[PDB]
Each structure stands twice: as structure tokens, then as C-alpha cells.
Amino acid sequence: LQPELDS
Amino acid sequence: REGVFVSNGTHWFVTQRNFYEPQIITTDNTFVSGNCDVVIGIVNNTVYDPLQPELDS
Amino acid sequence: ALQIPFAMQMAYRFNGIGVTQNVLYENQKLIANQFNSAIGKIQDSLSSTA
Numbered sequence: 001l002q003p004e005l006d007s
Numbered sequence: 008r009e010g011v012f013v014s015n016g017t018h019w020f021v022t023q024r025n026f027y028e029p030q031i032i033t034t035d036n037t038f039v040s041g042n043c044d045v046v047i048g049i050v051n052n053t054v055y056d057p058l059q060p061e062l063d064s
Numbered sequence: 065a066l067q068i069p070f071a072m073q074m075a076y077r078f079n080g081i082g083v084t085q086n087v088l089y090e091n092q093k094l095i096a097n098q099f100n101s102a103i104g105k106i107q108d109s110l111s112s113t114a
């Protein structure tokens with residue numbers, strides 16, 4: 001999830 | 008991930024194997040392994056990713 | 065009797081031994097061969113033995 005929490 | 012991929016003639020679902028209860032195919036209904044090049048009888052269809060519309064905000 | 069494709073039946077029998085079903089579909093030629101060869105050894109044993 002942490003790469004998508006770049007959003 | 009557990010169950011079978013089936014089609015009603017137009018759409019693809021995953022069901023448990025001992026009772027017909029169809030679900031939309033998603034990235035948590037399923038697991039990945041490798042390219043489409045290897046598997047005898049693979050088919051092309053969408054997998055919905057439930058995080059993507061949430062993470063769009 | 066509910067019909068099921070034989071390679072998909074064998075994928076469920078792989079889940080029944082704790083091996084993930086992609087291990088069958090990614091190795092299906094090698095599992096279909098070697099099954100066929102192991103059956104050939106039954107014929108050769110029963111033909112040659114006494």
C-alpha cells in the first residue's frame with residue numbers, strides 16, 4: 001500500500 | 008485464491024466450487040504468478056483492484 | 065458427476081497436497097509427461113516380471 005499512499 | 012473461474016457466456020466470475028455463488032474477479036479474490044505465456048487455456052479478462060478508486064482521492 | 069477439465073481437476077489435487085495450483089499449470093507438460101512414462105513402466109513391469 002505505501003507506494004499508492006504517495007497519492 | 009480459493010474457488011474456480013467460470014463464465015455465464017459473457018462475463019467472468021470466481022465461485023466457490025461446491026455451491027454456485029459468483030463474485031466479481033479482484034486482486035484479493037486471486038493471486039498472481041508469472042506471464043500469460045506458460046498456461047495452457049488461460050483467457051483475457053479484467054481484474055478489479057479495490058484500492059485504486061479509494062487511493063484516487 | 066459434475067464435469068471438470070482434467071488439468072483443472074489435477075490442479076485441485078495439487079491444492080489437496082498443499083502445493084499451490086500454479087505449480088501445476090506452469091509445469092503441466094512435465095507433469096503430463098512423466099505421468100505417461102510412469103504408466104508405461106507398469107506395462108513393462110507386468111510384461112517382464114514372473
Ligand SMILES: *[C@@H]1O[C@H](CO)[C@@H](O[C@@H]2O[C@H](CO)[C@@H](O)[C@H](O)[C@H]2NC(C)=O)[C@H](O)[C@H]1NC(C)=O
Pocket residue numbers: 015016017018
Ligand atoms: C452474465 O452476468 C451478467 C451480470 O449479471 C449479465 O449482465 C447484466 O444483466 C443485468 C440484468 O439483465 C443488467 O442490469 C446489467 O446491466 C448487465 N451487465 C452487467 C455488467 O451487470 C449478463 O447478461 C449475463 N450473461 C448471460 C448470457 O446470461
Ligand SMILES: *[C@@H]1O[C@H](CO)[C@@H](O[C@@H]2O[C@H](CO)[C@@H](O)[C@H](O)[C@H]2NC(C)=O)[C@H](O)[C@H]1NC(C)=O
Pocket residue numbers: 051
Ligand atoms: C490476450 O491479450 C494479449 C495482449 O493484449 C493478446 O496478444 C496480442 O495479440 C495481437 C494479435 O494477435 C498481437 O498483435 C500482439 O502482438 C499480441 N501481444 C502480445 C503481448 O502478445 C492476445 O491476442 C489475446 N488473446 C486472445 C485469445 O484474444
Ligand SMILES: *[C@@H]1O[C@H](CO)[C@@H](O[C@@H]2O[C@H](CO)[C@@H](O)[C@H](O)[C@H]2NC(C)=O)[C@H](O)[C@H]1NC(C)=O
Pocket residue numbers: 094097098
Ligand atoms: C525437474 O525434473 C525434471 C525431470 O523429472 C527435469 O526435466 C528434464 O530436463 C532435462 C534437461 O536436459 C531433459 O533432458 C529431460 O527430458 C526432462 N524430463 C522431462 C520428463 O521433461 C527438470 O529440468 C527439473 N527442473 C528443475 C527446475 O530442476
